[PDB]
User: Which sequence fits this backbone?
């Protein structure tokens, strides 16, 4: 009996933002005038920002191998 | 008996934003004038922002292998 | 009995933000004028910021191997 | 009989280039007042600027001359 | 019989270049007042600037001359 | 019989370059007042600047001369 299994396999995950190009991004002019405004609950505001947000809860690898 | 399986497999996931080009993105002019507004619940606003949001809960690999 | 199983396999995760290019990002001008505003709950505001944000709860690798 | 060759080409030629500004008269030229006001500008790439009341500019990449002569006598 | 060869070519030629600003008259030239006001400017790449009331500029990459003669006598 | 070769080529030619600013008259030139005011400027790469009322500039990369003669007599 000769027993010589060979594993050369790749298991790979590439999750999120990868290899992207962002060349000169951004708006020319952004202007806001706010007068006598009332807010009575939570405010989120973005004015002329650049946001690059990545969440990766995933991308996990499981390899199980058994020999008998 | 010779027992000699060869595994050369690739298992691959490419999840999210990959290899993109964003060349000079953005609006020319953005202008907002707000006067005497009342808000009585949550406000979300984006004014001339650039957002690149990626979520990857997925992209997981499971490889199970047995030999006998 | 000859028993020579060979594992040379790769298990790999590339989770988050990887190999990206951000060449000269940013808006030209951002201007805000605020007068007589009332806020009565939490305010989050971004004015002209650049934010690169990455969360990776995932990307974990598990390899199990057994021989008998 | 005998053989006689006389080879006497004479060259009196002129090759001339006159390029740019030659022999001009500029009598009392007046550049006016120049005002440049800039606020809140953004430049993401290379800037070349010239500001000035009175410019005389002469640029001459050309005006080159090439003269070739071959003289050959084979007996 | 006899052979006589008289190779007597003559060159009196002129090859000439006159490139740029030659022989001009600039009589009382006046560059007026120059004002540059700059506030809150941003430059992310190379800046070249010139500011000035009166400029005379001559640039001459050209005006080169090339003369070739080849004389050959073969008997 | 006899052979006579006379090889007497004459060159009195002229190769001339006159490049740049030559023989000009600048009589009483006036550069006016120059003001440069700068506030809150930002530069992320190389800056070249010149400021001044009156400039005379002559730049000559060219105006070169090349002369070749080959003389060959083969009997």
Assistant:
């Amino acid at each position: 009996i000769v027993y010589k299994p060979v594993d050369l396999s790749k298991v790979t995950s590439k999750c999120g933002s990868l290899g992207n190009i962002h060349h000169k991004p951004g708006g020319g002019q952004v202007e806001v005038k706010s007068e006598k405004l009332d807010f009575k609950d939570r405010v989120q505001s973005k004015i002329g920002s650049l946001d690059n947000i990545t969440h990766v809860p995933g991308g996990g690898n499981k390899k199980i191998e058994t020999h008998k």
